[model samples]
Target: VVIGDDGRTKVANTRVAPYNSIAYITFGGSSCTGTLIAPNKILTNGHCVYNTASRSYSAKGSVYPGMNDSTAVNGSANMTEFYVPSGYINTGASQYDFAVIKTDTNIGNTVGYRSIRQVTNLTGTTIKISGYPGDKMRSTGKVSQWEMSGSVTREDTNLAYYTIDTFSGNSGSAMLDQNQQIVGVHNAGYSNGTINGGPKATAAFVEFINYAKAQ
Candidate 1:
């Protein structure tokens, strides 16, 4: 991720519904952001839990909903399983950078969950992103949620790009539409140095989430 001018602000109350539904994912020695889309399912970037270089998945992980700095406002859950698309595992393609994780506990019952919707055309739409950024965590020695909103500048069959400020830990953050429905999963910053984007929710992507939710 890249901070293109850094317009993000700390979330004042992470305990609220939509914000509370956001998550902090810890796997191996790394961390990323995620969102609860079901009672036991978290939507995130495939790279957050899978290492394409090693061709292996993280052996263990945890999910914390509504984590405010050092505090876990709604506790946390151990990851029981995860699902990533074969396209990503096989070719490491950006279009398949999204994944869904299953938690041991139904934490979303308390924190609530966001609805994932397929957004066909996102260009010029008001989109919001909320998640943990590594820069802030390293500076403060704890994790806190930050957010920014901007209009989508580009949209493709499987990806959407914007100028929202983000950092390493923000991968897997949800790109929410004006209605607060998740329309994409954030994965990377563009080489152009001014844009960041990820897999836009589509029929196939939503099917993947549904498959994971049933597990």
Candidate 2:
């Protein structure tokens, strides 16, 4: 995702409810966004953990929940393991660009987690996208959460597109429906620059998440 003429707003309070469920991910020099869907599991982009160039998973991954600038409102945890679909690993397909990460600590016990729902159609659904955008961090010199709301413009079997503004660091940000249930994972923006989208929570994808949660 890339933001041009950004319309996202800074989250006023990072310590509350769903906002607290958002997490900032860092693995060495790379960073992305993720959401807590289980006490020790984080829903994020597959690309965030697996490097296509190096063909390996990232090491020393750390996750900070409810991060506000330099503050970690709910503390942080170390990533233990992560799960991603083979489609993404084999072809780097955007439709398979989702992952579930297990953290060493039960951070969700304090911050709480967002519920996930597999929505087959999201053409007209209103959704919220929140995460730590890199542009906002570059401008402020620190990491902070930002968010935007918009309706889904299009929906495919594996992807949902919206006009909501997003930046590079927003990858893996959850697409929260009106009920605050995760419907999709924000992964990329279109090359035409008119829309942004990511992998929707298909039945198989949700099944993968559930399997990872059990682990």
Candidate 3:
């Protein structure tokens, strides 16, 4: 969750394509972030759908693409299935905290979806992180997009860390590079919204994304 405070810019006035590719997700009492890697696929954190206390996976929800607060300005779609790494489902490890959501329609072809590819080292690469953070400022009865810009401070085989400001609802936000390509998936944060982390576009991560795209 966002540890410090919100440091994201309200994006209601912007019209970026990446903005169109993101969606607000809801399951039970949980609200999270996600991005469209394919017209019918959503990329998010595995834990977002996994209830730690109940030891159950929600695995289903609505995807409001290009959502403005609670309004799906472009449109919305229903999830058909949830795909998480076997290790995450079995061990609940943070290292495997990623998942895919298959929507019922080709929603991405309309608004657009980000292209996922493996990157060299992401350290020092400036990136934009956007999502529907639950604690950020919101319009009445509506949820708007928020964005934070930062650079990758560290990276590993499958994970990358940054200083982007984030909160609880940003669990599935997209970590996009300057080219607006998806470089990582925002999942965790520390220091009241200071440092955050997510899965990088590694070979394994790419394989999962490709699997989702084909599904």
> Model 3, residue 177: displacement in angstroms?
0.4
lDDT string for model 2 (1-215, tens) is 55456788899999997899999999877899999999999999999989888899887579998899779878999998889888889988898899988999898998999999987888999999999899899899989999999899998888999889998889999999888899999998885777899988889789888888899
Residue 75 displacement (Å), model 1: 0.8
Candidate 1 lDDT, 56-165, residue by residue in tens: 89777889898997798889999988898888899898989999899998888988999988767788888899999999998889899999999899888889999898
Worst 10 residues of 2 by lDDT: 1-10
Question: Local distance difference test, per candidate?
Answer: 0.89, 0.90, 0.81
Clashing pairs in 1: none
Candidate 3 Cα misplacement greater than 4 A, ranges: 1-6, 13-15, 137-141, 190-194
Please report how far candidate 1 places residue 52 from its true position, in Å. 1.0
Worst 10 residues of 3 by lDDT: 133-142
Better of 1 and 3 by TM-score: 1
Q: Give RMSD to native, each candidate.
A: 1.1, 1.2, 2.3
TM-score result, candidate 1: 0.96
Question: If scored against the real structure, what TM-score would every candidate get?
Answer: 0.96, 0.96, 0.90
